[PDB]
Amino acid sequence: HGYVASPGSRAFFGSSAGGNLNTNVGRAQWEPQSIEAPKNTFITGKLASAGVSGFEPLDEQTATRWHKTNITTGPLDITWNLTAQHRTASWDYYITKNGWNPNQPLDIKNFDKIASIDGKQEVPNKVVKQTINIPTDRKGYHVIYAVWGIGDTVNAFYQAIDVNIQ
Ligand SMILES: [Cu+2]
């Protein structure tokens, strides 16, 4: 169990720790760490919630619905907080392509992978800091999809992150 705290994930921003910068986020208000589903679950319109019961409000998609963190292209520091550390297989990061439609349901086919870090089947610390590169053809509102793949189960934790790139 864990979430991306920086840049704040869509779920994290729903919690008091995230400043309640997103409203009406269902279970994300209290447990943004709990978005757990089998690996390779990428159902169109159900990426933000990973299809998980109680997280449905996260799946709404418009250009103005969610709070964005202002970022630049190039290096971006990602910080996860884990409320329950687990042996880890992988960390994968995707971002929406230039030209994607922010008023349409999220579809993984409209993202590129942009980083992949091997967990080496070890147990990470409760704060995990990684650096990924944001490609320079991205400007404006984009969604980063951060995926923590568990080493000793068939599951992953899924974190949609709303960013405004300038
Ligand atoms: Cu857990």
UniProtKB/Swiss-Prot annotation:
Cu cation binds at residues 1, 86. This is Lytic chitin monooxygenase. Involved in chitin degradation. Catalyzes the oxidative cleavage of glycosidic bonds in both alpha- and beta-chitin via a copper-dependent mechanism, leading to oxidized chitooligosaccharides with a dominance of even-numbered products. Acts synergistically with the chitinase EfChi18A, and combining the two enzymes leads to rapid and complete depolymerization of crystalline chitin, especially with beta-chitin as a substrate. Is likely involved in a chitin degradation pathway that allows E.faecalis V583 to grow on chitin as a carbon source. It comes from Enterococcus faecalis (strain ATCC 700802 / V583). It comes from the Bacteria. It catalyses: [(1->4)-N-acetyl-beta-D-glucosaminyl]n+m + reduced acceptor + O2 = [(1->4)-N-acetyl-beta-D-glucosaminyl]m-1-(1->4)-2-(acetylamino)-2-deoxy-D-glucono-1,5-lactone + [(1->4)-N-acetyl-beta-D-glucosaminyl]n + acceptor + H2O. Its EC number is 1.14.99.53. GO terms for molecular function: chitin binding; copper ion binding; monooxygenase activity. It is found in: Secreted. Its cofactor is Cu(2+). Gene3D superfamilies: chitin-binding protein cbp21.
